[PDB]
Symmetry: D2
């Protein structure tokens, strides 16, 4: 699957490989509870984060560790990370969170199908 | 595959389906010669444009018919089309031209692997 | 003006007007503390958030309330907000412009950093 | 200033300075004819391309020479240019700002259209 993340690199023109991604769900006390995590693959994709039964309606945060990514490439970055925060609302739906990274900018879109 | 195009819609949060795409190669006389064309699929992707033997080094233009796309959705658009112009340079390489559409803006990136 | 925010609307081809913006700064105990807030003008710009004296070194978060913007236009948007989190002034004072481009299911930000 | 161009660099977090910009207008015979050209300033802005009298209805193309920009910085870029093609002034005169954001393998443009 219900949740996939895809990351691209606008400087090198490539998938952003080996990027750490953590997903959190907002709790009743307004704190962020860990939900799923992983590293992007050689295609820049992170699959297998969750299952249909685990992924309920609510507010989610996808934190992408952009700073570590740029540093591993020897490139100087602006942001600490990228945080993408959205509501999941329930008919049949799959969500892709896509992000395009540059050192001083990022862009994100949602593909919901 | 060597050349793929992928199109997303930033307003609806979906693949951009049924978008006409024409590819041209620049000729010796500096005119644009037709090279390949097709319509994006239900995943927003256009595969099968060319073959390894046909796709040689040179300057290519990918013209995406964004105006017709928005009009078919009932949305008022700014651009006539989106034109993405690049050089192909030869080791082993596959090119993806990705575009993210909004009515008054578009973004494009290249994924070369 | 060491910190400025500029917001554009990619659907209408316009400045994004009356957008609320909240800035936080990380405290010594690693929590987010309020720092400044304001709203974009008719030009989509927000000036006056802070001063050279107040805008010290630190880790800052700029949260742009994109959800309320779209809802006010009668549109149900995907994201709760657009944001940037960054370390400021580590090599001395700088001027920062955060430029954001909005659609209902997408946003982009960029930083423009200049040395005064 | 009915037509303005503003360009930012997403790698350096800076205005994109000294960027050449060429504007064309479609002629009655459907070819592109030269209309105006200029280069971005130290702020990444280009003013003065045209006038209210000269900027009539038509189909315009704004070609931003991104290739030369990156090459000047010692970088080999993907695209030949960034562009916009649009019909202008169809419902009366408007003011147009073309805002571009550049990386070596990516670009974004947006239009800001206001009614004078
Ligand atoms: C943000 C996120 C995604 C992109 C894409 C893209 C199309 N397919 N997969 C990604 C293209 C251009 N700009 C983007 C900005
Ligand atoms: C505000 C918001 C965005 C920008 C951009 C930009 C173009 N595409 N992505 C963003 C360029 C130049 N000035 C801007 C001011
Ligand atoms: Ca310091
Ligand atoms: Ca008219």
């Amino acid at each position: 699957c219900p949740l996939m993340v895809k990351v691209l690199d606008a400087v090198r023109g490539s998938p952003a490989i080996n990027v750490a991604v953590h997903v959190f769900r907002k709790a009743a006390d307004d704190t962020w509870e860990p939900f799923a995590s992983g590293k992007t693959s050689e295609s820049g994709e992170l699959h297998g984060l969750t299952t249909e039964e685990e992924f309920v309606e609510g507010i989610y945060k996808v934190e992408i560790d952009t700073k570590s990514y740029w540093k591993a490439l020897g490139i100087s970055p602006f942001h600490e990370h990228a945080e993408v925060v959205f509501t999941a609302n329930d008919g049949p739906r799959r969500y892709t969170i896509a992000a395009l990274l540059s050192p001083y900018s990022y862009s994100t879109t949602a593909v919901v199908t």
